[PDB]
């Protein structure tokens, strides 16, 4: 038993991280097959980051302007192109450690593991959620751009995130591996702010089921609620509305524990109005929303990768 | 910026995990060089779990009684021995993925990463602390024995934990890689319970410094305290006593932030007295104690 914020094993991704340098800017790249992916702002100088014209900067750069280092071996760049906010560097050698992989774009509320890297070397791994406002609450220092987020399904690595920037509140924004930003942000050092963040209701409910599975059931009650009545309350607390799809997804946990979803919603509604009243749930004094229903089933059933 | 419960990248350990089967028991083993380490209770029968005589049980086994599988390849066992509560299986092949590694025994309050495995395959990685009562608050299901805890420094893996058992409160107990249990626990299914769990005070203080480093100062106050007065108060909340050694260890963070250690102690006293009053610290509504001073410096710098 027990329940932890658990990341995917990172070995398959560690073997793909390299160091990319252009001029004085050094960050991380993702080496898959014979291509290295990294943020396009690697070609910017400290002064070109305010109003960059990426077309112009890239046109003026050459293959040899890019220094790629895989460990202590330097990869020869034989081509370069841009796709949205990601730079693609062709190298003359395929990564022998390339795993089975896909590029996937995730939606708000879904979770993934972040491999934080510096100078092409992985330093740590942690589990994150894509917030409803399309930011992630990560832990990144300078030089961490190009760090990637991923999931593992069967033996296939699904890359979903590449880190680009930090917003004034200390939250983080990035792109998918095709260079499309998550959220309404741009890779420029102009004033930007994320919209109001809301709570991922369906994940909170999944985590309450994990709490029950692990023996925490003090917060339950005999009452139920309608989806309409619950959503009226949730919207007043900056909670995401719960849809019928969300309820269906919690079916497995609803059956395993014998607690109807709308019964748990009544528990959550009461928890929102009254609070936790000095008690904790699974060792937390807050309502945790960075576990999806699948995450709960995955951890409570010992799925391996 | 930001602050998260961050584990070490697990690749170096993933390459060492194998499956070990003896009789009907299947669990995880750690394949380093030409030796596989696993809990000795893999040799127990369903009837031998209360008062096993492991010496006697092992004498009766032969090399071919142990089935070791690295992926889809079976490793030939050519020898076996016991070191305390850990079984050592000599195989005819050195693991080509063996990293630079050490065996270390950690002290309560120290943190490490756990690679949870089943049938020799990793399922997840998470960060843990050795509690003052010598348990860990992990996430483990049946079949997880042999999962290991570790740190990585430079490119050297320091193995510090191997999982053996779960105690009635849902907490977990295991050994170092020399087979010596942390705490007074034994690999027998006789009644055992962990002592009262306390809060790792020095780690809470490090985490408050991390909050300041990250721009949060709402919990500070104008007061200071003596070390003795702090410990008299803290122990009333089931907090571990803070020693002068702990104070010395917080020196670097005190200097970086300009906040004396005993001034931060005064802040903690008030937080225990008042609670958070609807506020959070580094995204938590509780005082977190699973970050060491070393962890804070590494993540924030
Ligand atoms: C990585 C780096 C990652 C970032 C640093 C701390 C953790 O995440 N990315 C940047 O620095 C990025 C680069 C521009 C997009 C080209 N810019 C920002 O993150 C800045 C804020 C920042 C700058 C320096 C830092 F050390 C930390 C944070 N974002 C920004 O300006 O936001 C818009 C805004 C402007 C003014 C007022 C309000 C809001 C890569 C950068 C260079 O090398 C890397 O590895
Ligand atoms: C040989 C034993 C060391 C094996 C070990 N006993 C235990 O834990 C048991 C509890 C238990 C949990 C779940 C189970 F299903 C079976 C048993 N403790 C215990 O008697 O306390 C003492 C005590 C006794 C009376 C009252 C109070 C405390 C054991 O079951 N270890 C497994 C790891 C556990 C499972 C969940 C996380 O930790 C994995 C091993 C077993 C065989 O193959 C494996 O992989």
From Swiss-Prot, chain A:
According to the UniProt topology, which residue ranges lie Cytoplasmic?
Answer: 1-305
Query: How is the activity of this chain controlled?
Result: Inhibited by pyridone-containing alpha-ketoamides compounds 13a and 13b. In turn, alpha-ketoamide 13b (tert-butyl (1-((S)-1-(((S)-4-(benzylamino)-3,4-dioxo-1-((S)-2-oxopyrrolidin-3-yl)butan-2-yl)amino)-3-cyclopropyl-1-oxopropan-2-yl)-2-oxo-1,2-dihydropyridin-3-yl)carbamate) inhibits SARS-CoV-2 replication in human lung cells. Inhibited ex vivo by michael acceptor inhibitor N3. Inhibited ex vivo by compound 11a and 11b.
Locate residues linked as Glycyl lysine isopeptide (Lys-Gly) (interchain with G-Cter in ubiquitin).
5, 90
Record: active site: 41, 145
Q: Where is the Peptidase C30 domain?
A: 1-305
Give the result of residue 132 to H, as annotated. In strain: Omicron/BA.1, Omicron/BA.2, Omicron/BA.2.12.1, Omicron/BA.2.75, Omicron/BA.4, Omicron/BA.5, Omicron/BQ.1.1, Omicron/XBB.1.5, Omicron/EG.5.1
Signal peptide range in chain numbering: none
Annotated localization: Host cytoplasm; Host Golgi apparatus; Host nucleus
Effect in UniProt of substituting residue 145 to A:
Complete loss of 3C-like proteinase nsp5 cleavage
Q: Which reaction does it catalyse?
A: TSAVLQ-|-SGFRK-NH2 and SGVTFQ-|-GKFKK the two peptides corresponding to the two self-cleavage sites of the SARS 3C-like proteinase are the two most reactive peptide substrates. The enzyme exhibits a strong preference for substrates containing Gln at P1 position and Leu at P2 position
How the protein assembles, per its UniProt entry? 3CL-PRO exists as monomer and homodimer. Only the homodimer shows catalytic activity. Interacts with host FBXO22; this interaction promotes the proteasomal degradation of nsp5.
Q: What does this protein do?
A: Cleaves the C-terminus of replicase polyprotein at 11 sites. Recognizes substrates containing the core sequence [ILMVF]-Q-|-[SGACN]. Cleaves and inactivates human TRMT1, preventing tRNA guanine(26)-dimethylation of tRNAs. May cleave human NLRP1 in lung epithelial cells, thereby activating the NLRP1 inflammasome pathway. May cleave human GSDMD, triggering alternative GSDME-mediated epithelial cell death upon activation of the NLRP1 inflammasome, which may enhance the release interleukins 1B, 6, 16 and 18. Also able to bind an ADP-ribose-1''-phosphate (ADRP).
Report the protein name in the record.
Answer: 3C-like proteinase nsp5
Q: Which organism is it from?
A: Severe acute respiratory syndrome coronavirus 2
Included range, full protein: 3264 to 3568 of 7096
């Amino acid at each position: 038993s027990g329940f932890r914020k658990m990341a995917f094993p990172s070995g398959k991704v560690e073997g793909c991280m390299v160091q990319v340098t252009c001029g004085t800017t050094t960050l991380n790249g993702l080496w898959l097959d014979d291509v290295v992916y990294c943020p396009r702002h690697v070609i910017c100088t400290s002064e070109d980051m305010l109003n960059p014209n990426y077309e112009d900067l890239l046109i003026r750069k050459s293959n040899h302007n890019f220094l790629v280092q895989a460990g202590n071996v330097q990869l020869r760049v034989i081509g370069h192109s841009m796709q949205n906010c990601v730079l693609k560097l062709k190298v003359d050698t395929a990564n022998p450690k390339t795993p089975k992989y896909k590029f996937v774009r995730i939606q708000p509320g879904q979770t993934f593991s972040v491999l934080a890297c510096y100078n092409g070397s992985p330093s740590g791994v942690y589990q994150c959620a894509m917030r409803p406002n399309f930011t992630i609450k990560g832990s990144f220092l300078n030089g961490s751009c190009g760090s990637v987020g991923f999931n593992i399904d069967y033996d296939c690595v699904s890359f979903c995130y590449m880190h680009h920037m930090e917003l004034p509140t200390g939250v983080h924004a990035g792109t998918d591996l095709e260079g499309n930003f998550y959220g309404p942000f741009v890779d420029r050092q102009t004033a930007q702010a994320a919209g109001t963040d809301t709570t991922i209701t369906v994940n909170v409910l999944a985590w309450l089921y994990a709490a029950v599975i692990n023996g925490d059931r003090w917060f339950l009650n005999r009452f139920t609620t309608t989806l309409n009545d619950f959503n009226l309350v949730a919207m007043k607390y900056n909670y995401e509305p719960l849809t019928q799809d969300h309820v269906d997804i919690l079916g497995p946990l609803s059956a395993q524990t014998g607690i109807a979803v709308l019964d748990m919603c009544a528990s959550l509604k009461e928890l929102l109005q009254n609070g936790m009243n000095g008690r904790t749930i699974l060792g937390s004094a807050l309502l945790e929303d960075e576990f999806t229903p699948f995450d709960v089933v995955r951890q409570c059933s010992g799925v391996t990768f």
